[PDB]
Write a protein that binds this ligand. Structure first.
Ligand SMILES: C/C=C(/C)C(=O)O[C@H]1C(C)=C2[C@H]([C@@H]1OC(=O)CCCCCCC)[C@@](C)(OC(C)=O)C[C@H](OC(=O)CCCc1ccc(/N=N/c3ccccc3)cc1)[C@@]1(O)[C@H]2OC(=O)[C@@]1(C)O
Ligand code: NA
Length: 981
């Protein structure tokens, strides 16, 4: 029964056909169970390890390395036990990467699983099989059950309240709305069928807790049909798109397999002459192994094997750096999307403001005489909940007792108040107890002291509620008509210790319209036009002007209805009970913006980031707060840039989308508006950050690219967000966006660095196959360079100093390629250089070397025919074509070039003369370690046998530097072109 809130208690019992005193019969239970199912959210279908390792080996680059490992294993089988090192190392990389992925998924938290924590194990129902209550498992509760809840119990299903067995019934509906005060519940129907959950005063929602009381109710919905179950369906339907960099890895792997297959076809096309080669020969099995070994090396030379270790290391370090700035990022890929933020939608109370209220102004009526009117405006000092402060008028200290209107003003503030003040000696600060807006009144009456009580020598703990207690002794608060949004006010019925009176407080428009008289000191005058105009005039200046105050109208019913003539169970009659009032005065309190917020808004407009405020204030004050903190200008038109919840719904779907393109302020929004705003922003391809802190906010937090939770927010809101603000501050968002931009600038530098090395490595392997030369580089050597030799300077590039204008540039387009245009041409020339400089270093040892044979170019290209000891090949040991020294010339050239290419990667276009290499101290130290590790595999005896290397001399190294160092001069000329042409 979805509309149970709008149905009578008799209508709900008649729908299910269940007696309130007997309950559901054993037949009705098993028959309702087969129709509505069990009262539980669906279990989240987790994936197995087998499904997780299949997803790990689903990536195309992973499948290429796995195939290359399989080829290497069968090549090592058909050949020295160091041969199986190449298959084993390749497998260890994939296996280790899988373990990392398995650990990440296990550590990951699911918000749908978190919703279960709001499911009680047990419930209490009355059924026809027993007279007494039955404590059954909440899973077995069906719609139509008669349920009994009490203090401490968690509500097991969406329950329509039938009768309240206690005096009142207060519920903690905080799981839906962050952290909130207890709400009073009744049993009368709510006329609006499209009413929101705040207005369903006759409903108990599954997952909430009973703060006080005891009631009997009938179950309306269970399972996914509850309010907390409908939110689970919205989250289960939301799909998280891949981050732009995750998508770029897909296109890179898809294009890489197309190039590898093309290089293989090119190698075969160049060697088609072997089809005319004589059929009889023993080099055919050799030729297959030759092309199979090249295929293995071609894959290892193309895949950046060390990139996943460098990326996750950069993100893990940035997470620790953001946590120092109170930004808790929960997912590592979210750091990239963090820097791409285009729109920030932020709640006000708590984040944009300090949520610490204090009354700043107040006015009472001074004189009413026809068209002449006079007011007594006041000012209060002290922005904290502490009673320290004084009341001023015209910047002059005054005594509140000398004004009679202020005596009645303070009594309304002290009696029509459910909150209190407490002093904490551990923190040494007065603390609030209840609503922040109500506690501002308790602090105000302590500063006024209308009865001139003596509190100078009182203890600080006693000083907190001293003046409040004095007023409470005078009038006995009988009952309380709680706040409701239909009338936007509350009242209390009081008797002396003089007749009974009612003290009313609430929104100014509703209370003043229900006032027929006006208090003037101790006397009262009928409410007239000129007085009502000037009263509302000051409300507009305090709420819309530069004060940006929240105003409360305080009134009194001098002649309240008799106690017997009032029904304290129908919230519909509460407005009638609060009529024919007498205006007493208006207080104006401020929720101050945080110190750092006004500057963070300027950083956002300097960085092209739009800020959208989300409040619960009226449209007039919301626009005023925007002008105060910097979202709008002081004199800027905002007719089509600010909307309310009702204004936004009355628009067609096309106008709603166009509204979100320019709006910067949304006041009094419905729960579904956060998710709709995200969709409209995504329709313009924005990258949206949204704040929230309740289960209500969870669907929008998951929908947005960067859901933002509060450190004090609910657990479900955190598990549905990418980043959690430890201090709830809005400035933490902007600081994390700056860091995400700084991380990406360094990230794309060591991505271009490692990828350009893989280009030159593939050119090296291609030149070997296309010319028929011996293998100048071995997959075992290429793995060491990509994982260790180039991995250390790549990590050091992640510590590059960020640009000082990084927050002075618009947000980066998500589809911006990492390498394109002239940079695509540069890494082709660097790749064409590395490929030629590596195979040439080995050919130098095989020909023009003093310590190597003077093998001719024909013999080196036809080295697979030395086995015959052909007279065509001058007499020589054929094993020389398998010598370790020529591979050390090629490897030491690649290592030294990559150390040089790492310096060229410090800046995209700025010359090394302008930006010297000693800017990044970590990069110089990484090159020394990578070079120190190069001599480790050349001299410490176990390693040269494995890597097929033999140490070089002081002369052979000088030949490496002859070919390697001009890399710096080449890229410098390519940088000079981009800068000046
Ligand atoms: C890999 C090795 C080789 C040899 C190769 O064939 O490479 C080609 C190739 C696949 C390219 C092309 C390359 O073509 C050429 O060399 C043309 C032939 C030249 C030789 C001719 C001889 C006659 C490029 C190399 O050519 C040059 C010069 O740079 C540029 C560009 O690469 C990138 O931008 C790198 C993204 C890495 C990249 C990959 C992943 C990634 N992941 N983030 C994460 C973030 C967070 C978490 C996880 C992950 C981010 C980035 C591409 O064009 C690329 O394919 C594409 O689609 C582009 C747009 O990526
Ligand atoms: Na999200």
């Amino acid at each position: 029964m979805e509309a149970a809130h709008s149905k009578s208690t008799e209508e709900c019992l008649a729908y299910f056909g269940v007696s309130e005193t007997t309950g559901l019969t054993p037949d009705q239970v098993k028959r309702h169970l087969e129709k509505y199912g069990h009262n539980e959210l669906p279990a989240e279908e987790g994936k197995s390890l087998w499904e997780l390792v299949i997803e790990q080996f689903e990536d195309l680059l992973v499948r290429i390395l796995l195939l290359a490992a399989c080829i290497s294993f069968v090549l090592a089988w058909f050949e020295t036990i160091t041969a199986f090192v190449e298959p084993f190392v390749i497998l260890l990389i994939l296996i280790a990467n899988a373990i990392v992925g398995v650990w990440q998924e296990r550590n990951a938290e699911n918000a749908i699983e978190a919703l279960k924590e709001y499911e009680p194990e047990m419930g209490k129902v009355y059924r026809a099989d027993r007279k007494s209550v039955q404590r059954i498992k909440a899973r077995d509760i069906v719609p139509g059950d008669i349920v009994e809840v009490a203090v401490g119990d968690k509500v097991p299903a969406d329950i329509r309240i039938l009768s309240i067995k206690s005096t009142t019934l207060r519920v903690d509906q905080s799981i839906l709305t962050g952290e909130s005060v207890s709400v009073i519940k009744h049993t009368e129907p709510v006329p609006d069928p499209r009413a929101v959950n705040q207005d369903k005063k006759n409903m108990l929602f599954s997952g909430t807790n009973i703060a006080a009381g005891k009631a009997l109710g009938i179950v309306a919905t269970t399972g996914v049909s509850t309010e907390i179950g409908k939110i689970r369906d919205q989250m289960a339907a939301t799909e998280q798109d891949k981050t732009p960099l995750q998508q770029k890895l897909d296109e890179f792997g898809e294009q890489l397999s197309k190039v590898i297959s093309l290089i293989c076809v090119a190698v075969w096309l160049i060697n088609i002459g072997h089809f005319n080669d004589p059929v009889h020969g023993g080099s055919w099995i050799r030729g297959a192994i030759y092309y199979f070994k090249i295929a293995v090396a071609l894959a290892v030379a193309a895949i950046p094997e060390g990139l996943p270790a460098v990326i996750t290391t950069c993100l893990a370090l940035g997470t620790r750096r953001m946590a120092k700035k109170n930004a808790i990022v929960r997912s590592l890929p979210s750091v990239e999307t963090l820097g791409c933020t285009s729109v920030i939608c932020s709640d006000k109370t708590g984040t944009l403001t300090t949520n610490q209220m204090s009354v700043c102004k107040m006015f009472i009526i001074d004189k009413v005489d026809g068209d002449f009117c006079s007011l007594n405006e006041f000012s209060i000092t002290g922005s904290t909940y502490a009673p320290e402060g004084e009341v001023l008028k015209n910047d002059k200290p005054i005594r509140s007792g000398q004004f009679d209107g202020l005596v009645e003003l303070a009594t309304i503030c002290a009696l029509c108040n459910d909150s209190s003040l407490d002093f904490n000696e551990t923190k040494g600060v007065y603390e609030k107890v209840g609503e922040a807006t109500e506690t501002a009144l308790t602090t105000l009456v302590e500063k006024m002291n209308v009865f001139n009580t003596e509190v100078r020598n009182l203890s600080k703990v006693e000083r907190a509620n001293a003046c409040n207690s004095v007023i409470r002794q005078l009038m006995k608060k009988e009952f309380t008509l709680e706040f409701s949004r239909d009338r936007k006010s509350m009242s209390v019925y009081c008797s002396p210790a003089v007749g009974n009176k009612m003290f009313v407080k609430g929104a100014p428009e509703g209370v003043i319209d229900r006032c027929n008289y006006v208090r003037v000191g101790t006397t009262r005058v009928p409410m007239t036009g000129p007085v009502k105009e000037k009263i509302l005039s000051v409300i507009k200046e305090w709420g819309t002007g530069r004060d940006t105050l929240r105003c409360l109208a305080l009134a009194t019913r001098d002649t309240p209805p008799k106690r017997e003539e009032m029904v304290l169970d129908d919230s519909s009659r509460f407005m009638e009970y609060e009529t024919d009032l007498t205006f007493v005065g208006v207080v104006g309190m401020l929720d101050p913006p945080r110190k750092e917020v006004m500057g963070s808004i300027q950083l956002c407009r300097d960085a092209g980031i739009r800020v959208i405020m989300i409040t619960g204030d009226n449209k007039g004050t919301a626009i005023a707060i925007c002008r105060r903190i910097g979202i709008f200008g002081e004199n800027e038109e905002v007719a089509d840039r600010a909307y309310t919840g009702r204004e936004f719904d009355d628009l067609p779907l096309a106008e709603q989308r166009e509204a979100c393109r320019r709006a910067c302020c949304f006041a009094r929004v419905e729960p579904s508006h956060k998710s709709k705003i995200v969709e409209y922003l995504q329709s313009y391809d924005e990258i949206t950050a949204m704040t929230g802190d309740g289960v209500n906010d969870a669907p929008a937090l998951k929908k947005a690219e960067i859901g933002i939770a509060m450190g004090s927010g609910t657990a479900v809101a955190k598990t549905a967000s990418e980043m959690v603000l430890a201090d709830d501050n809005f400035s933490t968002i902007v600081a994390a966006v700056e860091e995400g931009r700084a991380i990406y600038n360094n990230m794309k530098q060591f991505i271009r660095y490692l990828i350009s090395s893989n280009v030159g490595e593939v050119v090296c392997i291609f030149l070997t196959a296309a010319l028929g030369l011996p293998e100048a580089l071995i997959p075992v050597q290429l793995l060491w360079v990509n994982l260790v030799t180039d991995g250390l300077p790549a990590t050091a590039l992640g510590f590059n100093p960020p640009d000082l204008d990084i927050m002075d540039r618009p947000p980066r387009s998500p589809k911006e390629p990492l390498i394109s245009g002239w940079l695509f041409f540069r890494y082709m020339a660097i790749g064409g250089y590395v490929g030629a400089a590596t195979v040439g270093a080995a050919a130098w040892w095989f020909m023009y070397a003093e310590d190597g044979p003077g093998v001719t170019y024909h013999q080196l290209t036809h080295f697979m025919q030395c086995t015959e000891d052909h007279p065509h090949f001058e007499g020589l040991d054929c094993e020389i074509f398998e010598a370790p020294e020529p591979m050390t010339m090629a490897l030491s050239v690649l290592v030294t070039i990559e150390m040089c290419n790492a310096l060229n990667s410090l800046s995209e276009n700025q010359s090394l003369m302008r930006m010297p290499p000693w800017v990044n101290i970590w990069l110089l130290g990484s090159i020394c370690l990578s070079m120190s590790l190069h001599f480790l595999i050349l001299y410490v005896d176990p390693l040269p046998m494995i890597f097929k290397l033999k140490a070089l001399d002081l002369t052979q190294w000088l030949m490496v530097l002859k070919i390697s160092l001009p890399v710096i001069g080449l890229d410098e000329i390519l940088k000079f072109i981009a800068r000046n042409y």
